[PDB]
Point group: C3
Chain length 194, copies 3
């Protein structure tokens, strides 16, 4: 005495109502509908950069950070606005809880497309479950200030674990100018979203 | 009488059939299922690059543009093919309606993974609701022509509002070559997709 | 009826039909099944299974981790190249894909979900066109390094072509007496709709 419209279906052989879905796109997790490849973003809140410090120097920066998870890849993006003109190599460090992923350096939130914070443990940014990782490299960056070019240079990134916690360490190299730049890179997480 | 298979569920107490879903991945909007963090792309159509003028000069380029919404983040990508060799700095300006997000400089469309145009108003590219934004920086770029390296240089980006509309302004700097390059950067939108 | 439905399920008394209400710019129905309008699919080298590449006829190899991420109709290509041999000149790193199916012919790649599971999906979503043509090329700035030390600020070209029925992504890095060790990404468009 009732009908079902696709993607709902009714099996008369077992009197059961189902939702049909494409398994490469959607899935069931603990009985609830979910995506196979959700976009999760771990980020500094809007207008709420985190304070970063160049090692033990009295040199600081505001950083806006987004860590965008697609499939098992993380796209890491940072916008760094250093306060102090410097010559040399600055070391910027981001520390994350090695079990939960929680940023210990500064305030980060898992933020949906809605603009609302999501109740998601941020394990999805951790490179390995075993707390072992080799990943490092360099990206080209351009330092500027107030819309004026200052320098074409580079920034290293390195992913490590120390004392059980996950670290992303960035080293910018400057000559005379404030370390003010945006850079991104990608890395892989072995932590499945399930 | 009838049964439900997960992710459908039946509560015998209140005689109600529901769809169970993971709130960080899916949500309900106006009674309809939606994604918490949908991917939307606002782009120039395939084979319909946008013609851009270099400021008040009589010089032009064609550009393919994609603006990808990930969570609240926007990944802006442009591929610029300039016509004219130059030594100096070129200004490429994109204007968007400050309320709708619609590109006023030339044709852009919201394009689904299906390859069909979507009937979505592109507010999701706008940085703020109160028409305030500070975001600028520079990216390293390489100018080339027909597969040959020409110059390693840089391009600024700046996000502004003027007279109620949203602007992305790019400034490429060249020494003799045509401005032909690809660049990308990320910025944040305060406009929740709800 | 004797039952109720909670949104996003709805019941039309008029026709005695239970339906799912969904936002069509985000979700759709394909072959009677729920799907996404713009799903993320990633074609990639497997975890800890980098692809071995040779530079042309030279006795010069690199290991490459590759991800090709599909959103909407755009593909974000990312490669991490770890060259074994110091060199001066321009290296060619060539990736070939079946021009109809998209499968990587040069080495092992898999469509990988967010779950960490391989997905049973033909990788046609990386192909620029059904009609086996494409013009897309450019250069990206790169920085070569080794063991955390800066070596060189340089560049890498990319070019998308078809030859003899197959799709090629060809990268050429230019080095001056360092190992070609760098990461680069670029974006291109696919005209293959995911349906
Ligand atoms: Cl599918
Ligand atoms: Cl939530
Ligand atoms: Cl979840
Ligand atoms: Cl929508």
């Amino acid at each position: 005495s009732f009908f079902t419209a696709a993607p709902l279906s009714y099996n008369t052989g077992n009197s059961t109502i189902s939702l049909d879905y494409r398994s490469p796109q959607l899935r069931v997790s603990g009985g609830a509908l979910a995506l196979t490849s959700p976009v999760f973003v771990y980020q500094t809140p809007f207008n709420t950069p985190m304070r970063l410090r160049n090692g033990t120097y009295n040199e600081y920066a505001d950083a806006h950070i987004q860590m965008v998870r697609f499939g098992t890849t993380v796209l890491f993006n940072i916008d760094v606005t250093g306060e102090t003109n410097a010559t040399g190599t600055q070391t910027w460090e981001l520390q994350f809880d090695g079990t939960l992923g929680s940023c210990l350096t500064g305030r980060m939130q898992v933020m949906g497309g809605t603009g609302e914070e999501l109740d998601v443990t941020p394990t999805f940014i951790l490179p390995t479950s075993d707390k072992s990782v080799y990943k490092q490299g360099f990206m080209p960056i351009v330092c500027s200030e107030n819309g004026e070019f200052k320098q074409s240079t580079y920034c290293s990134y390195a992913l490590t674990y120390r004392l059980g916690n996950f670290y992303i360490t960035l080293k910018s190299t400057t000559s005379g100018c404030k370390p003010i730049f945006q850079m991104s890179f990608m890395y892989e997480s072995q932590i499945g979203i399930v």
